Amino acid sequence: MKLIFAIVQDQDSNRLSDALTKGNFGATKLANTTFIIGTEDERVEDALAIIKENCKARQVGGATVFVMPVESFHHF
Amino acid sequence: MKLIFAIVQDQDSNRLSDALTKGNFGATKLATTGNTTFIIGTEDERVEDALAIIKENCATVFVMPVESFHHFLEHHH
Amino acid sequence: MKLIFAIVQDQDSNRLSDALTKGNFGATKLATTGNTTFIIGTEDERVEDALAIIKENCKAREQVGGATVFVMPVESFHHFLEHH
């Protein structure tokens, strides 16, 4: 399991949550906007691909992503 | 040391902070999406206690390994 | 690469972002509860520099001051950029 911290532009935010849900990822937003995204190790590449694809220029556009190891995952 | 990310509903939020304080855990609340995310630093032993509180007062939880922890503190008169 | 979570007092916040930019660190500020939380991506070597800034830029409120920091390992880092 991996925890992904994705920092993206506000402009990109809404469409990225749509794309992330569409792709079956559970995500959380905190305002640039920061997304926290839990994924299984295999699905990581898919997630990045979505993020890459949904980051556009406002003239300039970008996204920064961190992939963090998870000791354990729990859903209650 | 572990860093715990807990995503919970607002309805659960206020009670959980009360329960978390009560249990001697230092926590931080972020208003997110309508949900709240709690970041909870804990020692490896106390992790189970923390999870139990969350479970009982609600949720999705991640337990992250911490390379290094630091606290700086000052008093003056 | 390391991800740093720094919880600091609001009063310290603006000055710490100034100091963190000045030191060439990219940081992100979250409004939280009272305290502000900074997320700071850094290379393993620069970690000590970052801590020092945080330590230095935490002052006493009112009498009392403090900051709490977590340094998290990063499996992988990714950056995507475009111009038009």
Numbering used by the authors:
A (entry chain A): 1 to 31, 41 to 67, 92 to 109
B (entry chain C): 1 to 33, 40 to 64, 96 to 114
C (entry chain B): 1 to 33, 40 to 68, 92 to 113
Cite, word for word, the article reporting this structure.
Here, we report the crystal structures of PstA from L. monocytogenes (LmPstA) bound to c-di-AMP and in the apo form. On the basis of these observations, we conclude that PstA is related to the larger PII protein superfamily, but has diverged through evolution to specifically recognize the bacterial second messenger c-di-AMP and thus is structurally and functionally distinct from the canonical PII proteins. The structure of each LmPstA monomer is composed of a four-stranded antiparallel β-sheet packed against two α-helices on one face. In the LmPstA trimer, the β-sheet of the three monomers form the core, and the α-helices are on the periphery.
